[PDB]
Design an enzyme around this catalytic site. Structure first.
Site, PDB file in Angstrom:
ATOM      1  N   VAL A  27       0.877  -1.172   0.000  1.00 15.86           N
ATOM      2  CA  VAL A  27       0.000   0.000   0.000  1.00 15.86           C
ATOM      3  C   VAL A  27       0.917   1.226   0.000  1.00 15.86           C
ATOM      4  CG1 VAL A  27      -1.667   1.381   1.348  1.00 15.86           C
ATOM      5  CG2 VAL A  27      -1.967  -1.107   1.184  1.00 15.86           C
ATOM      6  N   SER A  28       8.192   2.223   2.341  1.00 18.13           N
ATOM      7  CA  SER A  28       7.335   1.129   1.889  1.00 18.13           C
ATOM      8  C   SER A  28       6.368   0.725   3.000  1.00 18.13           C
ATOM      9  CB  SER A  28       8.174  -0.099   1.490  1.00 18.13           C
ATOM     10  OG  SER A  28       8.950   0.115   0.324  1.00 18.13           O
ATOM     11  N   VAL A  29       5.085   0.561   2.664  1.00 19.50           N
ATOM     12  CA  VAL A  29       4.043   0.170   3.632  1.00 19.50           C
ATOM     13  C   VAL A  29       3.221  -1.029   3.114  1.00 19.50           C
ATOM     14  CG1 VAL A  29       1.985   0.943   4.891  1.00 19.50           C
ATOM     15  CG2 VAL A  29       3.888   2.528   4.495  1.00 19.50           C
ATOM     16  N   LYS A  44       5.240  -0.616   8.231  1.00 17.73           N
ATOM     17  CA  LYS A  44       6.150   0.237   7.485  1.00 17.73           C
ATOM     18  C   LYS A  44       7.570  -0.212   7.759  1.00 17.73           C
ATOM     19  CE  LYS A  44       7.178   5.239   7.281  1.00 17.73           C
ATOM     20  NZ  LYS A  44       6.629   6.438   7.953  1.00 17.73           N
ATOM     21  N   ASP A 155       0.750  10.490  10.758  1.00 19.63           N
ATOM     22  CA  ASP A 155       1.971  11.072  10.203  1.00 19.63           C
ATOM     23  C   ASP A 155       2.588  12.153  11.080  1.00 19.63           C
ATOM     24  OD1 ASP A 155       1.522   9.165   8.146  1.00 19.63           O
ATOM     25  OD2 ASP A 155       1.097  10.644   6.617  1.00 19.63           O
TER      26      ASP A 155
HETATM   27  F1  LIG Z   1       1.410   7.232  10.227  1.00 23.49           F
HETATM   28  C1  LIG Z   1       2.154   6.119  10.331  1.00 23.49           C
HETATM   29  C2  LIG Z   1       3.307   6.151  11.119  1.00 23.49           C
HETATM   30  C3  LIG Z   1       4.111   5.024  11.264  1.00 23.49           C
HETATM   31  C4  LIG Z   1       3.748   3.857  10.609  1.00 23.49           C
HETATM   32  C5  LIG Z   1       2.591   3.825   9.823  1.00 23.49           C
HETATM   33 CL1  LIG Z   1       2.225   2.321   9.064  1.00 23.49          CL
HETATM   34  C6  LIG Z   1       1.755   4.958   9.654  1.00 23.49           C
HETATM   35  C7  LIG Z   1       0.452   4.963   8.782  1.00 23.49           C
HETATM   36  N1  LIG Z   1      -0.656   4.200   9.404  1.00 23.49           N
HETATM   37  C8  LIG Z   1      -1.904   4.066   8.901  1.00 23.49           C
HETATM   38  N2  LIG Z   1      -2.416   4.653   7.831  1.00 23.49           N
HETATM   39  C9  LIG Z   1      -3.682   4.228   7.728  1.00 23.49           C
HETATM   40  C10 LIG Z   1      -4.610   4.586   6.733  1.00 23.49           C
HETATM   41  C11 LIG Z   1      -5.699   3.934   6.340  1.00 23.49           C
HETATM   42  C12 LIG Z   1      -6.276   4.627   5.355  1.00 23.49           C
HETATM   43  C13 LIG Z   1      -5.564   5.726   5.098  1.00 23.49           C
HETATM   44  O1  LIG Z   1      -4.503   5.718   5.958  1.00 23.49           O
HETATM   45  N3  LIG Z   1      -3.887   3.382   8.742  1.00 23.49           N
HETATM   46  N4  LIG Z   1      -2.858   3.295   9.417  1.00 23.49           N
END
Ligand SMILES: Fc1cccc(Cl)c1CNc1nc(-c2ccco2)n[nH]1
Length: 337
Positions: A27, A28-29, A44, A155
């Site tokens: 979705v 690097s993630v 991530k 974020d």
């Molecule tokens: F904001 C961060 C910070 C550190 C690691 C990670 Cl994976 C993130 C983003 N996390 C996250 N994003 C979403 C999301 C879902 C839909 C749009 O964004 N869910 N969870």
């Protein structure tokens, strides 16, 4: 009692994660299923986390902030891990958080929905701000929601080119940071919320500036040109001098820009979108505003533990930032449920 890892290539890159995480897809993630908690999660992998002094510090910064956030409207750390068994092998950092439904872009509302969503952003900002953390970068795409309209801020932890032209990356930033007028503070987040709340009510960007100057013009049209006192406070004499070139404009009637809007919404916007950051409403004051009467509960609007960020003013070697990041990985305790 260190878990077993498995290896898997995804977007040209090798992910080595604990067996608990399954169904990794990019979705690097990556999205995944955590079989120990039953939660959909985002994972991530930081790229080249310790390549330079600046990247090492940023990795530490990001890990400190996420380890600290323990609040319902703020994104927390569910897990942090590394395949390495010692500091000497340490070179990869994986961060695990809840997977949320959709960001606030996808979702663009009724006045009830706007109350509930802005309430939640402010509840989370009170928490963040009380720990003397500034988000700096609140936009609709950093605000995720689920089916039930329950919100989290995302974020924490931007080039000249990213900030140039007709771009969302600048539409929500407070004028004092957009133009480096002064040492800014927490109040810049409240400006962003004003922009967001306006957007949820009208369905349109408040300040869709085509560049920094057009945006400033759009801003000054709405809230008026600065007054004598605010001018004193603009530390940058080059920017103060530019401002003074503009022909003076008064603050517009907000009831005639936001036609049909709840007057309490209009009122709150006026207190948020005040040009002078010293006179802006705080997250803590906003929560007590009549507009949120349905949701307001002064016993369920918690603040944060103190957050030591003295590290920000420290100049360390790469290995030292890496060592500090290691300690925080291995000391991680997961949340309880
Ligand atoms: F904001 C961060 C910070 C550190 C690691 C990670 Cl994976 C993130 C983003 N996390 C996250 N994003 C979403 C999301 C879902 C839909 C749009 O964004 N869910 N969870």
């Amino acid at each position: 009692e260190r878990p077993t890892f498995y290896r898997q290539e995804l977007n040209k890159t090798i992910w080595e994660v604990p067996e608990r995480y399954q169904n990794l897809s990019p979705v690097s993630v990556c999205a995944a299923f955590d079989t120990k908690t039953g939660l959909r999660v985002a994972v991530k992998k930081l790229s080249r986390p310790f390549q330079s002094i600046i990247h090492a510090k940023r990795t530490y910064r990001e890990l400190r902030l996420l380890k600290h956030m323990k609040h319902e409207n703020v994104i927390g750390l569910l897990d942090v891990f590394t395949p390495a068994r010692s500091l000497e092998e340490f070179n990869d950092v994986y961060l695990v958080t809840h997977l949320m439904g959709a960001d606030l872009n996808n979702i663009v509302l009724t006045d009830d929905h706007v109350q509930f969503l802005i309430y939640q952003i402010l509840r989370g900002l009170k928490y963040i701000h009380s720990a003397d953390i500034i988000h700096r970068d609140l936009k609709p795409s950093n605000l995720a929601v689920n089916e039930d309209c329950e919100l989290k801020i995302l974020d924490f932890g931007h080039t000249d080119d990213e900030m140039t032209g007709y771009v969302a990356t600048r539409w929500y930033r407070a004028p004092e940071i957009m133009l480096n007028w002064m040492h800014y503070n927490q109040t810049v987040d409240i400006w962003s919320v004003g922009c967001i709340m306006a957007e949820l009510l009208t369905g349109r960007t408040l300040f869709p500036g085509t560049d920094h100057i057009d945006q400033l013009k759009l801003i000054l049209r709405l809230v008026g040109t600065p007054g004598a006192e605010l001018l004193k406070k603009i530390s940058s004499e080059s920017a103060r001098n530019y401002i003074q070139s503009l022909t003076q404009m008064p603050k517009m009637n907000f009831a005639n820009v936001f036609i049909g809007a709840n007057p309490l919404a209009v009122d709150l916007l006026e207190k948020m979108l005040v040009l002078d950051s010293d006179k802006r409403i705080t997250a803590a004051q906003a929560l007590a505003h009549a507009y949120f009467a349905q949701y307001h509960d002064p016993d369920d609007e918690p603040v944060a533990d103190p957050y030591d960020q003295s590290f920000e003013s420290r100049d360390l070697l790469i290995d030292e930032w890496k060592s500090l990041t290691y300690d925080e990985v291995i000391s991680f305790v997961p949340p309880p449920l």
